[PDB]
Amino acid sequence: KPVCLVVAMTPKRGIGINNGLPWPHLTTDFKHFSRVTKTFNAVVMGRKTWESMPRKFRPLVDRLNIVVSSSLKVCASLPAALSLLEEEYKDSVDQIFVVGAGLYEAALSLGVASHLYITRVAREFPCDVFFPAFPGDDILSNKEATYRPIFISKTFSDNGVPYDFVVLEKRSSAAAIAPVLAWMDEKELIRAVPHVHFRGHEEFQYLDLIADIINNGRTMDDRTGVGVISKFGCTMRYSLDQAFPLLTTKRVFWKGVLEELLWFIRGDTNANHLSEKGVKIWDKNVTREFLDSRNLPHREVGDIGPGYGFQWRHFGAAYKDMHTDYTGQGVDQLKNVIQMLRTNPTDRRMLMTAWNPAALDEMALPPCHLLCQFYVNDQKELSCIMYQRSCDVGLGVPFNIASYSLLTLMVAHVCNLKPKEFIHFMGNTHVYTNHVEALKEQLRREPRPFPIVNILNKERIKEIDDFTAEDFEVVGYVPHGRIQMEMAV
Amino acid sequence: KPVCLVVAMTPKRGIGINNGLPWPHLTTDFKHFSRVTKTFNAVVMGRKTWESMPRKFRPLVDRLNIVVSSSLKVCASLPAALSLLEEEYKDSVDQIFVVGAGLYEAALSLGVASHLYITRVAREFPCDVFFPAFPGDDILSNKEATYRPIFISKTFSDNGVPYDFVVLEKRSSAAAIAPVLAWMDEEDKELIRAVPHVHFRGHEEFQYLDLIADIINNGRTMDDRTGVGVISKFGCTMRYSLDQAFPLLTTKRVFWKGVLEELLWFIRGDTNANHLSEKGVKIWDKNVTREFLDSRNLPHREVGDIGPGYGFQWRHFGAAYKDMHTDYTGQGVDQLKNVIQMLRTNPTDRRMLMTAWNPAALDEMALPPCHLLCQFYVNDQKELSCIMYQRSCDVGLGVPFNIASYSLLTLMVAHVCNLKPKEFIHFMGNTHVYTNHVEALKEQLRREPRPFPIVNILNKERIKEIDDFTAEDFEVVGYVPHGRIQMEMAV
Ligand SMILES: NC(=O)C1=CN([C@@H]2O[C@H](COP(=O)(O)OP(=O)(O)OC[C@H]3O[C@@H](n4cnc5c(N)ncnc54)[C@H](OP(=O)(O)O)[C@@H]3O)[C@@H](O)[C@H]2O)C=CC1
Ligand SMILES: NC(=O)C1=CN([C@@H]2O[C@H](COP(=O)(O)OP(=O)(O)OC[C@H]3O[C@@H](n4cnc5c(N)ncnc54)[C@H](OP(=O)(O)O)[C@@H]3O)[C@@H](O)[C@H]2O)C=CC1
Ligand SMILES: Nc1nc(N)c2nc(CNc3ccc(C(=O)N[C@@H](CCC(=O)O)C(=O)O)cc3)cnc2n1
Ligand SMILES: Nc1nc(N)c2nc(CNc3ccc(C(=O)N[C@@H](CCC(=O)O)C(=O)O)cc3)cnc2n1
Ligand SMILES: Nc1nc2[nH]c3cccc(Sc4ccccc4)c3c2c(=O)[nH]1
Ligand SMILES: Nc1nc2[nH]c3cccc(Sc4ccccc4)c3c2c(=O)[nH]1
Numbered sequence A: 001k002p003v004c005l006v007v008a009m010t011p012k013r014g015i016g017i018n019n020g021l022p023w024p025h026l027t028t029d030f031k032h033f034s035r036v037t038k039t040f041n042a043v044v045m046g047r048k049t050w051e052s053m054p055r056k057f058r059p060l061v062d063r064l065n066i067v068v069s070s071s072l073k074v075c076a077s078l079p080a081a082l083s084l085l086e087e088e089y090k091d092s093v094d095q096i097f098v099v100g101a102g103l104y105e106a107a108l109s110l111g112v113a114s115h116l117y118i119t120r121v122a123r124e125f126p127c128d129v130f131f132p133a134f135p136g137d138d139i140l141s142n143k144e145a146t147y148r149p150i151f152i153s154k155t156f157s158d159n160g161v162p163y164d165f166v167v168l169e170k171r172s173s174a175a176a177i178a179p180v181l182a183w184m185d186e187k188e189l190i191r192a193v194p195h196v197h198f199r200g201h202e203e204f205q206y207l208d209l210i211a212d213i214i215n216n217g218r219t220m221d222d223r224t225g226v227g228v229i230s231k232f233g234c235t236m237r238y239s240l241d242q243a244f245p246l247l248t249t250k251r252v253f254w255k256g257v258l259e260e261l262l263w264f265i266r267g268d269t270n271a272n273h274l275s276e277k278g279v280k281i282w283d284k285n286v287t288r289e290f291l292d293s294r295n296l297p298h299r300e301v302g303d304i305g306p307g308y309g310f311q312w313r314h315f316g317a318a319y320k321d322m323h324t325d326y327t328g329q330g331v332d333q334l335k336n337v338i339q340m341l342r343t344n345p346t347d348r349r350m351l352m353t354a355w356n357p358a359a360l361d362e363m364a365l366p367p368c369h370l371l372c373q374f375y376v377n378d379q380k381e382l383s384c385i386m387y388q389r390s391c392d393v394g395l396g397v398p399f400n401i402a403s404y405s406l407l408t409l410m411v412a413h414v415c416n417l418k419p420k421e422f423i424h425f426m427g428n429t430h431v432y433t434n435h436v437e438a439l440k441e442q443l444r445r446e447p448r449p450f451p452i453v454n455i456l457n458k459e460r461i462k463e464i465d466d467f468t469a470e471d472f473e474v475v476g477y478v479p480h481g482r483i484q485m486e487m488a489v
Numbered sequence B: 001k002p003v004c005l006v007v008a009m010t011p012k013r014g015i016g017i018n019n020g021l022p023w024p025h026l027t028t029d030f031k032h033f034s035r036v037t038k039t040f041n042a043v044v045m046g047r048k049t050w051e052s053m054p055r056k057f058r059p060l061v062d063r064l065n066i067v068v069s070s071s072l073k074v075c076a077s078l079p080a081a082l083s084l085l086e087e088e089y090k091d092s093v094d095q096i097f098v099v100g101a102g103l104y105e106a107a108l109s110l111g112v113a114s115h116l117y118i119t120r121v122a123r124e125f126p127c128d129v130f131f132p133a134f135p136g137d138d139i140l141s142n143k144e145a146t147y148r149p150i151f152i153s154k155t156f157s158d159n160g161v162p163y164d165f166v167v168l169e170k171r172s173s174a175a176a177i178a179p180v181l182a183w184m185d186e187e188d189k190e191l192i193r194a195v196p197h198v199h200f201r202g203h204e205e206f207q208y209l210d211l212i213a214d215i216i217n218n219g220r221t222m223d224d225r226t227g228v229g230v231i232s233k234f235g236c237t238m239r240y241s242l243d244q245a246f247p248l249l250t251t252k253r254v255f256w257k258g259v260l261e262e263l264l265w266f267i268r269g270d271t272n273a274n275h276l277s278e279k280g281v282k283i284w285d286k287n288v289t290r291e292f293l294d295s296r297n298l299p300h301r302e303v304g305d306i307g308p309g310y311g312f313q314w315r316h317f318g319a320a321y322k323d324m325h326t327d328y329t330g331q332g333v334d335q336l337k338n339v340i341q342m343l344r345t346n347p348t349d350r351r352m353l354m355t356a357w358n359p360a361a362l363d364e365m366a367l368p369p370c371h372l373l374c375q376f377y378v379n380d381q382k383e384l385s386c387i388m389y390q391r392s393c394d395v396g397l398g399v400p401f402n403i404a405s406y407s408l409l410t411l412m413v414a415h416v417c418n419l420k421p422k423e424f425i426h427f428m429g430n431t432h433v434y435t436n437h438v439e440a441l442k443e444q445l446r447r448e449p450r451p452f453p454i455v456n457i458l459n460k461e462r463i464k465e466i467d468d469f470t471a472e473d474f475e476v477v478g479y480v481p482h483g484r485i486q487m488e489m490a491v
């Protein structure tokens, strides 16, 4: 008699309003709902849930229906509705399904539910009916039997609404090839949330990367003196067609991403412009003491030299200081990339580099993310690869995933393309030794659905220089807590 | 009654000389032989094989030994051996292994052999005893039941000898999740696969072969610069191990002399393609004709001048280009010197990179670099690894050549920096097969890989700097590729 709950709920456990659904139509959720409930199977719904459904759908085709009212033409309650399933139906009736509140809370208190099939809607919506609070509730937001997630899907979206699917549970042909495999094969491996067998969420790539570097990396020294554990040659890829990979296992500093990127695009080399908006990510690397450690006593405090964005907009131009005007100097790699994207998308030379050996000594830091390449296919879908030489997995990586994915949206939009994928290529890939305990905590967190990032005022924005800080909404971002990690300078 | 043969052979099926083994000691192969034959099992050998084995090892421990001979103290033939095994031994005797020539040929004629366990020694050695010709032979060299390979390992080595293991054969919570998986598979013809019969695909060349299947089945058809038209994917990865052997691909013959000459040309900083052409390496010629130079708006270029590309940017990044005849010594950044310098002094530095992509000089080049960046890494055991990023990749023609080129550079660099080469890592942008290469590539996919060769640097003693290497300082050892497959270059 094991029973399974099938629900869609917002992060605050919201499920409905005005005897109806809080959110516009979720197509894929519906496909999911259909498939799960038939393989005959029994669905069991509360009085009012039956009404919510439009009549042409009301008898749920190819499934035994049950309503639990006391006033309609069908059982008196849930315990008596289980009886009906044992008494008759014992033949054919495979697994059962409960599909409104009060019928959910009924099933929880009577403790007959072994599994929960939960569509996590990432947005909050006005609601007047809620799913009961339960142990394992953390899977929804930051709010002895308990419900442990065993499955977590990729992020989907419909009508501007991001959503995940999770499932929670109460807690000699070629055997004569084996002796050879045996001898070819081989202390305590950490794994990100080991209880999740089916790891669809694309954020597992980042969580499994962290595990790999800690289990199989090699302890090394470095420029900073802090010490690392590293690997070399690592790969992640993030899909941009449904959702946006803003990491959920720790809050990513979104404003910083978006400001630094707009700062790159103007070709600005004054870190003070970032700092004065409360984005201090450059400050430790442009202090007097650090410019002097870089043999650049002539540099003003804040001046990053001819770095990142200077090279994007003015490659090979002679650098002076951060107040000087370079308009018309060097190669504008960004405009050329866009022009080629608009006029000839099959060209294979759509690249932008930040690596200029002639100028490395003049920069505060040698660039980390130093190359990106764009690719269009035959459906007008755009993808981007970025090659990063040196990757602080703790701190920089999540920020960088966001940064370059956002640039892919920005470029897709001015070129009249749909963004498809971000491909992340990593060289020296390291975890600072003093971030390890923090990262082990992070690996005990189950990811939440990815948000969507929208571009507002699309009508106004025609060229890449037209974007401002106020032209993006992040929708449905529900991360776990910030985890503090000190920057190795 | 099924039997298994266990052998090690050269490419010409050579197994013995002077009642001994042809090659120096192969440790892993001995491990392999021991682990396969005990799990009690019986081994069956010919008299002369019994006598090959040193005496301290002689009765092979923990195995029933049977010798076929007519002189000793033991059965008179193979049929007689298999009778022995059935009459007594039916208990605890699990599998039976045949381990000399002529015992191998009797076992193949009788037809009682179900699996062959063949260790493929990649070098030839003087041999006076051979393993019989058998259908499936083609796994060894370019020389009805057939023995088809089902398992093919990675390449190993010991004492300067590269080798493979292949195996031939005669011819609660799950339940609940199943439905949610079921619909995420559904949405979304006849898949092409490289040697599908091969179930355990350790040979690192399966990376290249599976990359060709993947582009063909899942890539999108597009136009391009050339007019020829391609199938493409975006963002592809391979990695090749360098500690044991060298990834010179075996499913078609790769042009070693071209790899090596071009790489040396790169290191010199040379931009004259005539110097390549004059040594019988014409890979640059179609891209430096008078005709191709004008279609690039460079009528002032002498035929063969590739402009300030590859090696020019490596040795003189940003220097002002004139022509292929000028001396640039001292001008621009010598990225290669710097990388080496950093590897010798500071192996944990994370800025060990070299790029040929210079957007200020791209129009002046005949061709924008394809392989445009490489970065180096040293771990805690003095092992050098290398990543190269290639923006555009002709999977049919250039990729194998590109794999060998940067792998060789890795060796060259590791040697002058006193490191051991470990791994070459290939990062690929626009990754594509030309449409007129497809039929040929599908043929190529029917060919199982052979063990990789080793590349030795000769005259290590005299070679202290990167500019010291010449064409005569390398040997390729044990290279046994399949035939060339002619594929024309899309101009
Ligand atoms: N997104 C989702 O996952 C889902 C959302 N919904 C939404 O939620 C709302 C419907 O849920 P809700 O309002 O809670 O109403 P329900 O559908 O749970 O129906 C409540 C009625 O069912 C009967 N009932 C429920 N529990 C008991 C009990 N323990 N003992 C006896 N009878 C019981 C009663 O009928 P009687 O009055 O006859 O005694 C009660 O009036 C709608 O807005 C609907 O759209 C519904 C299903 C799923
Ligand atoms: N690398 C490898 O895979 C292996 C290599 N080897 C090498 O091969 C050589 C040994 O092979 P090889 O020279 O062929 O000799 P074998 O070991 O096959 O033995 C030859 C002798 O065994 C007996 N014999 C063999 N076949 C028959 C038969 N069909 N019927 C009756 N008696 C038979 C005969 O002994 P009698 O004179 O008593 O009648 C014959 O003279 C050595 O150099 C050895 O190191 C051996 C094993 C493995
Ligand atoms: N995870 C999740 N997501 C939900 N939306 C959900 N909704 C409810 C209740 N609300 C309903 C709304 C519409 C229908 C309806 O007409 N459905 C057709 C759709 C067929 C198709 O489109 O394939 C069907 O069932 O074949 C049924 C119930 C209960 N649990 C739920 N759980
Ligand atoms: N594929 C293959 N490779 C071969 N070399 C091979 N050689 C022969 C004959 N030559 C032999 C010489 C010495 C031994 C010996 O003392 N071996 C130890 C290894 C101990 C260990 O390291 O475990 C053992 O097994 O305990 C065994 C065989 C026959 N078939 C063969 N087949
Ligand atoms: N060790 C370390 N040094 C960094 N310097 C940066 C400069 C700009 C952006 C970044 S990315 C970043 C910035 C703030 C917080 C996390 C990543 C870094 C960065 C980083 O991530 N790690
Ligand atoms: N389509 C295609 N065009 C090429 N132009 C080249 C110029 C120099 C080296 C190369 S590599 C190469 C290796 C073997 C044969 C031809 C080119 C290419 C090359 C290639 O491989 N494919």
Ligand SMILES: O=c1ccn([C@H]2C[C@H](O)[C@@H](COP(=O)(O)O)O2)c(=O)[nH]1
Residues within 6 Å of the ligand: A223, A366, A368, A369, A389, A390, A391, A392, A393, A395, A396, A397, A400, B350, B351
């Ligand atoms: O976007 C960025 C910029 C910088 N870094 C960090 C990675 C290195 O830990 C740090 C120092 O660079 P190196 O000089 O060590 O490469 O820069 C990032 O991770 N992401």
Ligand SMILES: O=c1ccn([C@H]2C[C@H](O)[C@@H](COP(=O)(O)O)O2)c(=O)[nH]1
Residues within 6 Å of the ligand: A347, A348, A349, B225, B370, B371, B392, B393, B394, B395, B398, B399, B402
């Ligand atoms: O080492 C090389 C050099 C060139 N090419 C090929 C890849 C491209 O198919 C062709 C030129 O096309 P574009 O990169 O120009 O699109 O050069 C390679 O594959 N490998």
